[model samples]
Target: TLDRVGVFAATHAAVAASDPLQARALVLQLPGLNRNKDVPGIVGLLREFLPVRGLPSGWGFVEAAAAMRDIGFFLGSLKRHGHEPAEVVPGLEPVLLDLARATNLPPRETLLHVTVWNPTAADAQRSYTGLPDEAHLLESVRISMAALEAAIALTVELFDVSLRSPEFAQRSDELEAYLQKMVESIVYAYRFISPQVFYDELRPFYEPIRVGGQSYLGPGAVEMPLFVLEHVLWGSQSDDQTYREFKETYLPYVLPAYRAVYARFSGEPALIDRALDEARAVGTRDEHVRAGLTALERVFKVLLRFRAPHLKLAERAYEVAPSMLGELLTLTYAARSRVRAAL
Candidate 1:
């Protein structure tokens, strides 16, 4: 349904440049990537999986803006020790907190993702386990998103009157309506991407548990950690060979195989279809994510290439010899905008 790569970068670029309100609206449409240049944005994918590209004028701007909201966080957290790369866990917490606060999520649920982050501990114990605990943790995912929508709602109320003026009351209603629409798009986007989130957020939980498990959940879940590790480190490499290898050889096999297993387990082929649908969309998100990550590498290369770090982790985050922030920023936004247009 989607291109093999380039999805996430496309979306992210499109979302960041919008005015505040429109940016929020586009974030909701981030998941589907259906072309939404219209009043009722986001036409879902056709049954065959091709994007429905007939959106209204200026709608793509909103969708693209939605995609870029996370840039600050992604870069901030790309490394573990705040300013370094290996410590993805270090910067992740602060950014997640910011995102959670902006979104209105509970502190505890936000912290759930905290545990999922791994570090340089001697022991390789899986951080959290058990069906009850995992489900409880995942609840935060939905809750956090809900809170974000709620926060944006409160935020827009402050501005409704200033723009509307003497007709403040009437203008307020219209403004509220517009805000609500953005919330709706975000809510739906959350749904579209929720299933895909499993691969990233829940992978560690499932990976260590499986013992000779079938291809179903095992493959996709297992591939995630490796995928994260690879991209987290190699994101900025100019040689697309490594990135291309991961996309073509390793990434694609895991989910499709997982879908087949899921279908077998459920005894309904529809489950496979659902998995494929989400896999395609999530794939787009990752494509953009990869583009951003690669740009991130280049940025860090510029900032860190000449200097040597005292900390091993810091050194690891900056080991690459590459440099330059402009290409990364340029490629990142370009890729982000394209994906947003598709959605």
Candidate 2:
């Protein structure tokens, strides 16, 4: 435990120092000092960290997400300490790679879940600033993920109910109910994120970090679960090049299940697409079709509403339009309008 603490401190010290020589020297000591954590920071998560074991796996064998947080913090610290392009720092890559290898996860980079979700509730959450400002950032991820996950669960349910189902109309009643809840869920999730705090205080920690000889993005809010919502509603059917690139870049950071949803719906008819088809198949004059069209239009409109703040948050925070969230919003509105035209 004493050694583990020293190693942890050393690791933090290296990142905390922007000095090339200081960080290099500290990193050199890491292999000798960095024995697997003697005290398991997280219980079910590790296989090999030093063990006073209740389990067979070494206290060291951390699962991927847990291990990735350590990696994230290390790299994030570099950026936080003002080392731009931390990858070029001598001796850094080897230790970062070594950390991954010791943890037994593949040599993958850190991600949103690694930093935000996988950390144990204790000292697991880390901030470069380690201040209340960063604490607020932590809660933003924690609370937002909770709300986002609930909305995603509902979206998944929407995916499963199917426009082709015999109970399509009845199912839509429930789905529409879910949509209202999702809107509330999302609106509430992002309700408190202060752009000033995020940009000025915590955003630096989320800059790109070097891992495995490649630069991986920090836990930016862009990696949040809204991508899943956009996918099932629109992106799944998209051939749009810009959005496709966005998906390809950020998709890997999502939890596996969310990634699977994106994969499952890849090239498939979007929920909005099917809704449009159903509308065209029976037009609005028919009672059941009208109900379905109305319900379906709400999903797209709801999606548009969802994107509005998201587009602006990034636009404001970074003062840029890089993600094409605005473009997606436009498409979502069109999707809604097309459904309405049928009605």
Candidate 3:
């Protein structure tokens, strides 16, 4: 949770800039939001799905869809943060059941309702109608895909804004935390919405295939390409053996494939070219330093938006360079601390 003074100060600053959305986003990170004594954050997120209140305006449809998806993500966060499911699930059950009763609910709402529903709750056990038919499931998929599309648009929009903002470098830590939550929301949508929807319905669109004795996986959706890049680059904690395992087994295929897929959606053909240029230069000296910083550049657009690129592969030697991996890990730790501080 953020210091109370800092939170209000930042909110006022954003509002004075005529960017109330950023203010509201900052407020949403207040310590009170996650206190869970009354579970206010959990309830507040759920209320967005209601008919009259609906979602707040000025957030735009793209943000609204992402917010709707986040309703579930926050609940998951509660559990992950050591809140008892007993306290969390009961409050969630009634609210979710009510949303299930809403009429003319948008696709995002329908999907949100289903994603957060507690099938194991007492109310759910009594009132649950079991699985929907193929038609309803199909509708859910269509809606989720559309929601994902909106999410992708918002990601790029935010990235572009951050790119030009003079404040971005100073506030990169805050923005990174905010983006982490947004991406976590997207991950929740995919992980909880329905396995059938993602795997059976949408998997064929982005499934892994064999090519040139290598197995390459597709990006699956627009937001997914960047998500994969972020995960592969910053997500893993690597040692000599694990780094080699990831390099030999995973890096060979994912780096180029993700860039290609991102280009397909973003219509930026130059991404592959620039990324390939970096790919060709991977095995040079201080490779770990190059790999880590390059990955950051790709994701954050820290180096001229789409122009700069990172190494396509990790190497066993990353462990041999004691200072490089240690320093990179330290940097990541400090950034993550800022992320938590802003929570």
Candidate 4:
């Protein structure tokens, strides 16, 4: 059961903007936020009943990548200001290169251009209404968008790799911790850099962001580090009120069904114990991957039933995320035990 008033307050503040539809769409694209429309009993289920924070391993990394995509922007800014290349972290080089390559831009400089330019530039400008447009704020939004794009790309790559095999599954605890951290990185990046900047940037849509008497910009907004943007798309009260219904009636059903699908394979007491051990070992755990694959199939089966009318809603379903999820989980486990055993 959702606190209708609170959910409305939170969701409305998110869409108050110039483009409520786009805002809502943006929220659904995040992996953690999608839930099946036909079910409502599932939502808080996975969040409460299980422990996994991340899923579909490829998507997990993509989530992480999207969360930090703007590092390229930061790097480029430093370079433009004469920061020595040697001072840059060697680890970030490949990631930034990939980002540049993906966008078909030349390295380094293009990262900076895309971060501050593109579709974000128009939105960052001040409104017809009273609002001060600041350069710092625009730059911050650029970074945020870039981070999101990076995460998306990373997820795609990971998904491609994981789908190659049927041996990928992640523990609930590990999934939960991994996803929460990555998502929080996004929240922290926004907060640490400057909530004022983010709020100001987003203010054009939702004015004075708040919920249940809590204004997001007020004291402890960072602590509230809640996934507000997601809540908006998934639960907001727009003309359609579709998301509201989604949160109330649909998510509950699908989330549980999703869990049940996985439980039969991964969570049975005996199977879970062995899977956990193999996860820590250097051996292949086909059973683990099989569980994930089975769950993936069940998810699509549900979607197939709703393919026509619920296409819009289905766009946000978990089916879109699992491939990415599987790959990342497989890679992380394998890479840790094999490629980077010393780490």
Candidate 5:
């Protein structure tokens, strides 16, 4: 029962963003706030409920990637705070093992761009890797979207829990802890949701930042509305209230934002085609590449200012971005490399 409940929790917890703009806002700030102290336990629970075999194409990979990224940030925070490397490195083994298993699964074609620290590498250049495949990337994005929608729905019950849970109502400590957890959950909720906005709202504008003559595909994965519906039904069983009622009450604030996202992407097909054409054109030119890279670098710097406080974890958590961006740039030029060959 606990395992089932956790699967529901993790699933819905994926989508907590209320709007496109807030989604982007959350991604920058969430890692610092979300201290996944129980991540190993949670991962164990998730493994029990989330199958390692016979799953959909991109589901395991994206979920595994998300889990790794979440825990990586947590570990990074620990390293930043003066935690011993021995203590820090041990906790990562299980997650790394899980990541390896998930990556080796059937849908091995898709690769997520992640930051890696090369202990032996003396130079900063050999760190991050971003490979682009439009289809696989879209699947990843959908996984995040579905997760957010489920997260928003589940959080509504927590809103009620704060008011009605006997323990929460009676104990000040419970209330405080619940609030802290909710805040953390909310931050992640937006963090996951914002990518959709980045793709639909920001991607169109930034389309010219092409990779190897292909429009730079934002981080996205799959279409799983049917999967979302199935899980929503599964999760609704956890609470007394129906999913419909909870959604009716809480989703008004967020559902419309997602709807707007879908509407724009579907409605503006011609506009998107034009944007990609411009993107491809810009890809072939030197001036546009310089200008686009400059603009994006400045944008990320502003995002860095919104970084949350994570003490010892702060420096390591913050280091991921530059490495990832560096890797992406390297991939753009190294078109004949393994990344291109696989994608």
Candidate 6:
């Protein structure tokens, strides 16, 4: 048997968003689903008892991701309604444990599962708002992920080039262009989803959900891959407290290949450091050295360009608070100042 999990997701999400009190009452009924064997049974009830017969029993990534969602709604439904998942779904631990083992995830859906691997163009239904705007949010993330892939490629390439080649200045030009493209990718999301809509409607759904005794942050955009940017550019050689903590916070959420990139850059000179070392060694009074500083400064200028609007968006959506995004914005601005002084 199988569950038409879509139906349940729709019902729970709509109800939870509209009337959390009623949502709490609805979730309070399923206390008996506590064992591994009961996982399928629990899933069935969430699907409003619409079980499809003769489905494959083998659980793969698709099934496991969906299972996280099924249980995720249960957990999020409780949380949104001001209740704990454990109090409402006691067997939630065992359920998420199996999912953890199955998916190698943190017993919940990540931005990777939500935006990267999610089925798009009609099957893209991991939604809470059930509005056209929700589709924009999803599509925006998809677009941003495309650019993120490109940016990661650039980061890796720049790191390698900076590691060995004398083209740190040359690659900085390349990085500047990609940073502009990165802004182009992000602005689509900014245009599509208004700050008011994102803040009021979508932000709550992506709030933290506790599972398997750990708080798994939901599929918020904060999990996006800026770690690679910070690591390769400013973080590799620097041990600033804020940067180190920020790096570690998002390290678990990014891809393993990028993780390898970060680890390889351990104790290596940062791109800025390399440029500075080159400047010190070579003719600081010469055209080539001056051009190198100009190239590096242009990269940070584009970085600042990207972060300014980003900080504006974040400030408006999050209502004027200090955040990691803001911190980085400040960090890059200061870093750029240092690069400027060397010029």
Question: What does the lDDT come to for candidate 3?
Answer: 0.33
Estimated TM-score for each candidate: 0.18, 0.67, 0.24, 0.22, 0.20, 0.73
Off by over 4 Å in 3: 1-169, 177-181, 184-192, 196-207, 218-237, 247-343
lDDT by residue for model 6 over 1-343, one digit each (tens)? 1122334334323322322112233333444343122444444455552122322367664565555554565554445445555555545566566766666667666666555454453532445445566678767665545445565566667655532244756766766765665576458767776778877766666667766566776776667676676677776866678878878777766655667777877768776777676667765686767776788788888777778887887788777146667777888888898788877
**Span of ten consecutive residues with least summed lDDT in model 5:** 117-126
Give the runs in model 4 whose Cα sits over 4 Å from its true position: 1-135, 160-343
RMSD (Cα, Å) for all candidates, in order, is: 24.6, 10.9, 18.4, 23.3, 23.0, 9.8
Deviating ranges (above 4 Å) for candidate 1: 1-128, 131-133, 136-239, 249-332, 337-343
Report the CA-based lDDT of candidate 2 relative to the real structure. Answer: 0.54
Ranking under TM-score, best-scoring first?
A: 6, 2, 3, 4, 5, 1
Cα lDDT of candidate 4 equals: 0.29
Each candidate's clash count = 39, 10, 0, 37, 22, 0
Q: What is the lDDT of residue 118 in candidate 3?
A: 14
* Global fold similarity of model 2 (TM-score): 0.67
lDDT of 2 by residue, 238-303 (tens): 788987888888876666678888888886897767777766775566676666666666666656
Give the alpha-carbon lDDT of every model: 0.28, 0.54, 0.33, 0.29, 0.30, 0.61
Task: Name the lDDT value of residue 288 in candidate 1.
Answer: 42
The best candidate by lDDT is 6
Model 4 error, position 79 (Å): 41
**For candidate 5, lDDT tens digit of each residue in 28-111?**
342323234333443343233333343345555445544434333333333333342224343444444555466442111111
The per-residue C-alpha lDDT of model 4 at residue 17 equals 29
Q: Which candidate is the best by TM-score?
A: 6
